[PDB]
Amino acid sequence: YEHVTVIPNTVGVPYKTLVNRPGYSPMVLEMELLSVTLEPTLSLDYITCEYKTVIPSPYVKCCGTAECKDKNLPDYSCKVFTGVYPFMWGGAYCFCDAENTQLSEAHVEKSESCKTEFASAYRAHTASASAKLRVLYQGNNITVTAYANGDHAVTVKDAKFIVGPMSSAWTPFDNKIVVYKGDVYNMDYPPFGAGRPGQFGDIQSRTPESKDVYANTQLVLQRPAAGTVHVPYSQAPSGFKYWLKERGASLQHTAPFGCQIATNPVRAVNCAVGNMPISIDIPEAAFTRVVDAPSLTDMSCEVPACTHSSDFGGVAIIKYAASKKGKCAVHSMTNAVTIREAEIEVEGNSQLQISFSTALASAEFRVQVCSTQVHCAAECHPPKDHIVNYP
Amino acid sequence: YEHVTVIPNTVGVPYKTLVNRPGYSPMVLEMELLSVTLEPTLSLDYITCEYKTVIPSPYVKCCGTAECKDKNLPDYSCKVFTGVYPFMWGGAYCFCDAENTQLSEAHVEKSESCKTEFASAYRAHTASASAKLRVLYQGNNITVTAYANGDHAVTVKDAKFIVGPMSSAWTPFDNKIVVYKGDVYNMDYPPFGAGRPGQFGDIQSRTPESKDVYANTQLVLQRPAAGTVHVPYSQAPSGFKYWLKERGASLQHTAPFGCQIATNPVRAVNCAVGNMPISIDIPEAAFTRVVDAPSLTDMSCEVPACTHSSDFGGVAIIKYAASKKGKCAVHSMTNAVTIREAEIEVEGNSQLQISFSTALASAEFRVQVCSTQVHCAAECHPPKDHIVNYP
């Protein structure tokens, strides 16, 4: 028998569903989010990290003129300084008084930290929706993990589950995303070769193993001090270090519909948005015929304690007269009231105790135990105030 | 000086562009498309290949009843056959005449071929457009490789190039693609765990290294022959082998706009579709002032040979009177006629020979050599035929 219901896409909220197969005793199934997943297809554009300035020993050409050549290196800087007369510990390095030149050379590269401390720029497109789930089935908790596309059929204990399709297709993941460790950010990052100094992408490496990198940081070589061998220079602070403090809160904190954000792989979990249809093909063996189930008569209900809140603040004592011993399903016939118990064991001329949740101060509700209904009258009192902390 | 022009997105067609900086001698640049790459971001869903039927030695329980257990393996089949009496070379395998059972066991896995022969199912989204090309600049051919987004600035010989954005955002790739060696196919492939028997995806492996696989192929175990130890069975042919012959022509052959399709990485090259804007920031040094360039007078033009075709079927002899020796740019002032030569050397009271292309039978056109225009009258004859085989 195929049971079809729709629950809101909210994690941590147990929902009760009444399965009524004609000629068979009612069945109450408790369902609670399993952990849906929206995993987008990623295409790595580049990685960014803290940059590092490669300066070799300067070429001090004694009695001659050094020549600068155009080298295809990031932020390559070359300058030949005339009229130099450098000194070392034991005197002048050059034989000539005049006509000595110093060739100052420098270029920019990935820091030693780039393997450990880095942010990845990804192109995110067409996310694959997947669904799992649980279910209080036959007095036991079962877990169902399925794609929420309304096609992926998952069978657990002969019960076939079809989850979705999701009412909302929204994805807290734009076309361009940035990943740093366990945090994901929606960012229209600059493309490769377009990074700005002191900003995210001042240094860009296509892959973390890449030998050649793009760099746009303001490296300018200066004339060395009189009689001194050194390479003085002026150079915008790390864009990655700047982004680390300027990034703000990640998608885990900013995303709508109560989305949980995870990495390795990058995915949106339990989106707090829209609803989720559930299809359960319950096998014939799970059902008990009305004749094979206990028959209940002379039913009465009393509410000795009630507090209208988000949790089960209500207590109800139901007296009954059962034809035989067996298990009966417990369900509220009023949508404004929900019962914690899904199934209770009946004996004969005995009583049952149930836990209920309602927002109503004056709660009048019907409880169906097996195939018989009983009216419950409840005067519910305020908790810590209207608003409630449970769904 | 920024020169801005627009060329059709067609590879192998040389285009002539006239750069006219006020107060500077005209400059003719020949441009020919080098490559335009559209690389989509890929997310691997699964791989498929030829399947292989794992059948271990059957459990022949002599004087007892064997028991089948539910094993989580693809297409797992188990059957216990009663009343068996199997024989080996030296007689009966069992001591008992009756009450012997044979447990036949089977499951389905990836073939040994799966590492070599396989198709990959990818989720393709938001393609990154990249560009380069051939420019006849200062009598030399220069190659510019740039992303056709209208942002990526590439500088070659102090000339800054900005290619795009593309007039057409057409791809040839859909949301779901299938890759087999050097061939790409647009296919709405079945999701993981939804593959049909004898069709693409009858066997599905999330990764080529994956131990567990999905299989939906009709494996049914049969009762063994009298006194025979064997595992007879009935079983849809390989879906991958079927797809290999049913796939049809790949995207390289079917894609519009003359798209070339390459793999490793999957990309669309030279999409025959729309036009491409080109921005060239030509440096000051490349230009020659009108006063510094030769002055041409007493110009005459004669066409001794002409054939109206896709190639340079026209010949023109231009007589001139130059003030001094130097290089002059050659350009057609009529859009219906195009000249092969971009630059020629002038001496004085001499003549020049140029090659031209036109579709006109009666071609009347103006040729600008340096800063002076000359009228050319041409009677062009039919080629081989209509329609042309060059752009």
Side-chain angles (χ1 to χ4, degrees):
Chain A
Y1 172 81
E2 189 190 28
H3 178 76
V4 176
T5 187
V6 176
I7 67 151
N9 184 29
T10 314
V11 162
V13 188
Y15 303 108
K16 297 261 156 53
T17 193
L18 182 66
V19 183
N20 186 76
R21 191 185 177 194
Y24 295 85
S25 191
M27 189 192 282
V28 178
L29 296 173
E30 184 184 72
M31 301 179 303
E32 192 200 340
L33 261 200
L34 245 259
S35 87
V36 183
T37 304
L38 301 162
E39 196 195 306
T41 307
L42 304 180
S43 187
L44 182 75
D45 269 351
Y46 64 87
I47 65 107
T48 196
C49 48
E50 203 175 310
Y51 67 75
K52 183 192 173 173
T53 310
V54 175
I55 311 149
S57 292
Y59 176 57
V60 180
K61 198 184 192 291
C62 299
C63 309
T65 310
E67 288 171 80
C68 276
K69 62 190 282 290
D70 273 296
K71 287 181 177 184
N72 192 48
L73 290 153
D75 263 336
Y76 184 75
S77 306
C78 193
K79 221 165 188 284
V80 173
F81 305 103
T82 58
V84 299
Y85 193 78
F87 286 90
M88 272 171 76
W89 139 84
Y93 177 70
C94 298
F95 159 76
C96 295
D97 301 314
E99 288 169 37
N100 304 306
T101 57
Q102 188 193 110
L103 184 141
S104 274
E105 200 174 15
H107 80 265
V108 176
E109 70 181 44
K110 280 201 293 290
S111 174
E112 304 88 342
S113 63
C114 293
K115 293 168 270 180
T116 309
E117 287 292 326
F118 72 103
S120 304
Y122 292 106
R123 280 209 162 272
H125 43 269
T126 318
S128 241
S130 182
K132 176 176 217 113
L133 192 79
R134 112 166 126 127
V135 184
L136 221 188
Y137 182 81
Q138 299 180 305
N140 298 282
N141 277 315
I142 64 159
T143 302
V144 178
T145 308
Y147 285 104
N149 61 354
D151 181 79
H152 187 215
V154 172
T155 309
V156 173
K157 274 154 164 56
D158 214 50
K160 187 165 70 68
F161 291 82
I162 292 158
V163 164
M166 304 280 275
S167 67
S168 189
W170 172 85
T171 170
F173 294 125
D174 292 333
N175 179 39
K176 288 167 93 75
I177 63 144
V178 166
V179 185
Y180 172 73
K181 294 179 184 185
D183 294 284
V184 184
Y185 298 86
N186 275 336
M187 197 213 291
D188 189 12
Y189 56 83
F192 197 94
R196 299 275 304 127
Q199 295 292 322
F200 184 95
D202 59 344
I203 180 153
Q204 289 166 333
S205 188
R206 289 267 176 55
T207 55
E209 289 86 55
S210 177
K211 290 275 177 284
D212 188 53
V213 295
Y214 162 81
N216 186 20
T217 66
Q218 231 187 295
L219 180 65
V220 186
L221 297 168
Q222 297 170 169
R223 179 176 176 87
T228 306
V229 189
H230 75 138
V231 189
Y233 66 98
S234 60
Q235 197 181 28
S238 181
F240 175 72
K241 276 189 113 78
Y242 186 69
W243 174 74
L244 284 180
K245 75 181 193 84
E246 297 294 321
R247 53 197 169 122
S250 68
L251 282 159
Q252 168 67 55
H253 311 273
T254 68
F257 310 109
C259 294
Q260 309 297 302
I261 307 293
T263 59
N264 201 52
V266 170
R267 61 208 192 269
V269 193
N270 314 333
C271 263
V273 62
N275 51 257
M276 200 187 77
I278 298 169
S279 176
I280 320 153
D281 205 300
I282 309 147
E284 187 123 43
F287 294 97
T288 308
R289 290 183 159 90
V290 179
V291 180
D292 296 311
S295 188
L296 271 77
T297 49
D298 304 303
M299 290 183 89
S300 295
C301 176
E302 63 186 303
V303 177
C306 195
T307 293
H308 61 81
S309 61
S310 308
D311 74 312
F312 301 97
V315 172
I317 302 159
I318 303 155
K319 288 174 197 286
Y320 62 90
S323 61
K324 59 176 177 283
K325 197 186 176 177
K327 293 168 197 289
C328 280
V330 185
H331 198 252
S332 187
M333 295 293 282
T334 314
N335 297 309
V337 179
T338 188
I339 304 158
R340 191 205 286 172
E341 292 77 7
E343 191 185 73
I344 76 101
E345 199 194 83
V346 294
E347 186 65 70
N349 25 287
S350 189
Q351 56 156 256
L352 63 102
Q353 203 195 295
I354 53 144
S355 303
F356 72 93
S357 190
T358 189
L360 265 72
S362 304
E364 296 214 81
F365 60 103
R366 288 161 291 133
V367 180
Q368 189 180 263
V369 185
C370 258
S371 293
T372 319
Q373 278 178 248
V374 63
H375 189 87
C376 294
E379 183 188 50
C380 305
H381 308 288
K384 307 266 165 147
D385 61 15
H386 289 242
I387 304 297
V388 115
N389 51 53
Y390 48 85
Chain B
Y1 172 81
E2 189 190 28
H3 178 76
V4 176
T5 187
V6 176
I7 67 151
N9 184 29
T10 314
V11 162
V13 188
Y15 303 108
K16 297 261 156 53
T17 193
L18 182 66
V19 183
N20 186 76
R21 191 185 177 194
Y24 295 85
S25 191
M27 189 192 282
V28 178
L29 296 173
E30 184 184 72
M31 301 179 303
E32 192 200 340
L33 273 166
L34 300 172
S35 70
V36 179
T37 304
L38 301 162
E39 196 196 306
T41 307
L42 304 180
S43 187
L44 182 75
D45 269 351
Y46 64 87
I47 65 107
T48 196
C49 48
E50 203 175 310
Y51 67 75
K52 183 192 174 173
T53 310
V54 175
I55 311 149
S57 292
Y59 176 57
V60 180
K61 198 184 192 291
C62 299
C63 309
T65 310
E67 288 171 80
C68 276
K69 62 190 282 290
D70 273 296
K71 287 181 177 184
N72 192 48
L73 290 153
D75 263 336
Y76 184 75
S77 306
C78 193
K79 221 165 188 285
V80 172
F81 305 103
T82 58
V84 299
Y85 193 78
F87 286 90
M88 272 171 76
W89 139 84
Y93 177 70
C94 298
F95 159 76
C96 295
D97 301 314
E99 288 169 37
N100 304 306
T101 57
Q102 188 193 110
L103 184 141
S104 274
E105 200 174 15
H107 80 265
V108 176
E109 70 181 45
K110 280 201 293 290
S111 174
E112 304 88 342
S113 63
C114 293
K115 293 168 270 180
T116 309
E117 287 292 326
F118 72 103
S120 304
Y122 292 106
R123 280 209 162 272
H125 43 269
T126 318
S128 241
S130 181
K132 177 207 285 150
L133 134 132
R134 178 190 63 88
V135 184
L136 221 188
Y137 182 81
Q138 299 180 305
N140 297 282
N141 277 315
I142 64 159
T143 302
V144 178
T145 308
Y147 285 104
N149 61 354
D151 181 79
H152 187 215
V154 172
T155 309
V156 173
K157 274 154 164 56
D158 214 50
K160 187 165 70 68
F161 291 82
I162 292 158
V163 164
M166 304 280 275
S167 67
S168 189
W170 183 90
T171 177
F173 307 111
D174 292 333
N175 179 39
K176 288 167 93 75
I177 63 144
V178 166
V179 185
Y180 172 73
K181 294 179 184 185
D183 294 284
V184 184
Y185 298 86
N186 275 336
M187 197 213 291
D188 189 12
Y189 56 83
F192 197 94
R196 299 275 304 127
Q199 295 293 322
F200 184 95
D202 59 344
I203 180 153
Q204 289 166 333
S205 188
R206 289 267 176 55
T207 55
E209 289 86 55
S210 177
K211 290 275 177 284
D212 188 53
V213 295
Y214 162 81
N216 186 20
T217 66
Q218 231 187 295
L219 180 65
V220 186
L221 297 168
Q222 297 170 169
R223 180 176 176 87
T228 306
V229 189
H230 75 138
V231 189
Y233 66 98
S234 60
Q235 197 181 28
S238 181
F240 175 72
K241 276 189 113 78
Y242 186 69
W243 174 74
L244 284 180
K245 75 181 193 84
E246 297 294 321
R247 53 198 169 121
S250 68
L251 282 159
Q252 168 67 55
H253 311 273
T254 68
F257 310 109
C259 294
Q260 309 297 302
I261 307 293
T263 59
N264 201 52
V266 170
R267 61 208 192 269
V269 193
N270 314 333
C271 262
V273 62
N275 51 257
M276 200 187 77
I278 298 169
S279 176
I280 320 153
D281 205 300
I282 309 147
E284 187 123 43
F287 294 97
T288 308
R289 290 183 159 90
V290 179
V291 180
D292 296 311
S295 188
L296 271 77
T297 49
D298 304 303
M299 290 183 89
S300 296
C301 176
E302 63 186 303
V303 177
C306 195
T307 293
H308 61 81
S309 61
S310 308
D311 74 312
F312 301 97
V315 172
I317 302 159
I318 303 155
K319 288 174 197 286
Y320 62 90
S323 61
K324 59 176 177 283
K325 197 186 176 177
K327 293 168 197 289
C328 280
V330 185
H331 198 252
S332 187
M333 295 293 282
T334 314
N335 297 309
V337 179
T338 188
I339 304 158
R340 191 205 286 172
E341 292 77 7
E343 191 185 73
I344 76 101
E345 199 194 83
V346 294
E347 186 65 70
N349 25 288
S350 189
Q351 56 156 256
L352 62 102
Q353 203 195 295
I354 53 144
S355 303
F356 72 93
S357 190
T358 189
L360 265 72
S362 304
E364 296 214 81
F365 60 103
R366 288 161 291 133
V367 180
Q368 189 180 263
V369 185
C370 258
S371 293
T372 319
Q373 278 178 248
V374 63
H375 189 87
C376 294
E379 183 188 50
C380 305
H381 308 288
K384 247 110 237 249
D385 77 14
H386 252 280
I387 304 297
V388 115
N389 51 53
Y390 48 85

